[PDB]
Amino acid sequence: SSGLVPRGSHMQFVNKQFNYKDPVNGVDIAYIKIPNQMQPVKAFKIHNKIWVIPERDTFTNPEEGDLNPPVSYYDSTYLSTDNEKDNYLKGVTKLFERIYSTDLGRMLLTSIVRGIPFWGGSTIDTELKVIDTNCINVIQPDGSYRSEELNLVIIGPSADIIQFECKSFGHEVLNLTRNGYGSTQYIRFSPDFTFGFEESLAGKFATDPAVTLAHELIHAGHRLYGIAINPNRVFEVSFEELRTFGGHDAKFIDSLQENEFRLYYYNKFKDIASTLNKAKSIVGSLQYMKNVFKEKYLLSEDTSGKFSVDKLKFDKLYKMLTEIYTEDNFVKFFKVLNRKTYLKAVFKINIVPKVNYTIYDGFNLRNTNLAANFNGQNTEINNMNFTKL
Numbered sequence: 001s002s003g004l005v006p007r008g009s010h011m012q013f014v015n016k017q018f019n020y021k022d023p024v025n026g027v028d029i030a031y032i033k034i035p036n037q038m039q040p041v042k043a044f045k046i047h048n049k050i051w052v053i054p055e056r057d058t059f060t061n062p063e064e065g066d067l068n069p070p071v072s073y074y075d076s077t078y079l080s081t082d083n084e085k086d087n088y089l090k091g092v093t094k095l096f097e098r099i100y101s102t103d104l105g106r107m108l109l110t111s112i113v114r115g116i117p118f119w120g121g122s123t124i125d126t127e128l129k130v131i132d133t134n135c136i137n138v139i140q141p142d143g144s145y146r147s148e149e150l151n152l153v154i155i156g157p158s159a160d161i162i163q164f165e166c167k168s169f170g171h172e173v174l175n176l177t178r179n180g181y182g183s184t185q186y187i188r189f190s191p192d193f194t195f196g197f198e199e200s201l202a203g204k205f206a207t208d209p210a211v212t213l214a215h216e217l218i219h220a221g222h223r224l225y226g227i228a229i230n231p232n233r234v235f236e237v238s239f240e241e242l243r244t245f246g247g248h249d250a251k252f253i254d255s256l257q258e259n260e261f262r263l264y265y266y267n268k269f270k271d272i273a274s275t276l277n278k279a280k281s282i283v284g285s286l287q288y289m290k291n292v293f294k295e296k297y298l299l300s301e302d303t304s305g306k307f308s309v310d311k312l313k314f315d316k317l318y319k320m321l322t323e324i325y326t327e328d329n330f331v332k333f334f335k336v337l338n339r340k341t342y343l344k345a346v347f348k349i350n351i352v353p354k355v356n357y358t359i360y361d362g363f364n365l366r367n368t369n370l371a372a373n374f375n376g377q378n379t380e381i382n383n384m385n386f387t388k389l
């Protein structure tokens with residue numbers, strides 16, 4: 001048993017208890033294509049605007065179409081059988097429910113779903129138009145395609161199994177992750193591996209994969225609202241990573257440059273409001289899309305129907321995405337052990353069985369010897385759950 005529904009009748013964020021063998025529909029189980037050409041891959045729609053592709057990522061980058069070698073870890077056989085892909089799907093499902101079981105996760109995932117990428121694709125500055133790279137192509141049961149917008153795709157890692165990241169497709173001129181528009185995010189991630197860190201409550205503990213996924217989700221939050229920090233602002237560690245980790249590592253960032261960041265994206269949101277005001281037509285109703293992006297960016301509307309940015313609602317949204325949504329704060333909500341700074345070993349894991357890992361407790365199963373002193377995360381005490389590689 002997987003323990004996917006510890007309380008209630010159904011999962012509270014994921015829409016369905018999928019099995020990889022579940023037959024394809026055209027709605028939430030579908031063969032899909034990423035806009036490059038590729039052969040369709042089977043995907044699962046776990047939530048509004050969120051899809052999961054239980055495949056090794058040989059699609060995102062044209063230069064990473066190979067799963068062989070040129071701390072990293074390589075294994076071309078990982079995630080090549082249906083049993084593995086089913087376990088991947090159930091593991092990702094489990095972590096989303098674990099994140100959504102905390103108040104902070106419900107806030108974060110709500111923000112992610114609301115952060116629809118902006119319709120800034122038209123070359124005519126009075127027309128709203130989608131950007132095709134923020135969509136996937138969904139195969140319908142009768143063989144026809146359908147273009148569907150989405151915010152987030154969870155896909156398996158590429159050649160380097162343990163290289164997780166949050167990446168998205170770019171624009172020839174627009175910097176969608178830095179101008180407030182946002183773009184569909186692709187998270188390379190695996191629930192079947194994790195990293196080990198040392199701590200002296202000389203114990204060798206393992207990172208909780210729900211923390212790692214939340215870290216990537218925070219990046220997606222930044223990038224869906226187009227308020228990411230330019231990756232060239234570094235320390236070598238990008239400020240974007242320090243902000244995501246949070247805690248006292250976030251304090252390394254120049255406070256006054258952050259106030260500079262805040263004003264830079266305040267003005268970007270204002271330009272988005274202006275574009276919404278100038279919009280007279282839509283390709284693909286106009287007012288509805290105008291209200292979609294009123295909701296996302298929390299814009300105010302006067303008696304005239306004119307949109308504008310309220311400084312207080314911007315600060316609240318901005319502060320939520322950059323200060324509150326952090327790895328450090330998720331560590332506190334989960335009550336797990338974690339490394340204290342953004343900067344040893346790699347372990348194979350299986351979180352799907354309820355007896356190995358639960359939505360509420362992770363590895364530290366309550367009413368067991370694993371409940372105390374993070375013994376569940378101790379790779380020696382709980383050796384049954386960790387195979388060193």
Ligand SMILES: Cc1c(-c2ccc(F)cc2)n[nH]c1NC(=O)CS
Nearest residue numbers: 162163164165166194195207212215
């Ligand atoms: C976060 C992360 C990991 C990771 C961390 C902890 C683990 F237990 C397993 C994997 N591997 N690559 C990245 N990518 C980045 O550092 C920038 S997003």
Ligand SMILES: [Zn+2]
Nearest residue numbers: 215219241244
């Ligand atoms: Zn990161």
